[PDB]
């Protein structure tokens, strides 16, 4: 249980750090970005999942 | 904090200062464009 909880929590932090830098760069980006609302939609939907996952796996570890 | 979240104790002691960095970030961006 803890095996999945901390992984999903550590990945949530790492993903966020990518999103924190990635999202504003992708927006202010002239060319190069049909490329990237996929990855915006990628991380976003994946971010919400991890939040719920860690939120659910919280009651099983504490 | 719960013992399961004792991992991010150094991270927690940093988070409150983050909003202030946004005020400083505005000056970086403005310096980057040369204060138009």
């Amino acid at each position: 249980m803890t095996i999945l909880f901390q992984l999903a929590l550590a990945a949530l932090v790492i993903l966020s750090f990518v999103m924190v830098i990635g999202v504003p760069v992708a927006y202010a980006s002239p060319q190069d970005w049909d490329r990237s609302k996929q990855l915006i939609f990628l991380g976003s939907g994946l971010w919400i999942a991890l939040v719920l996952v860690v939120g659910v796996l919280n009651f099983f570890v504490v | 904090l719960p013992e399961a979240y004792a991992i991010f104790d150094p991270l927690v002691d940093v988070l409150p200062v983050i909003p202030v960095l946004f005020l400083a970030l505005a000056f970086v961006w403005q310096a980057a464009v040369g204060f138009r």
Partner: peptide
């Protein structure tokens, strides 16, 4: 103990890095 200092490092540089990336990419700054 200096994990302290590692957090403010990546977090603190996260801001200016975006500006640097948008500069070399010549983005909409």
């Amino acid at each position: 103990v200096i994990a302290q200092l590692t957090m403010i490092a990546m977090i603190g540089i996260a801001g200016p890095m975006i500006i640097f990336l948008l500069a070399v990419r010549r983005g909409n700054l």
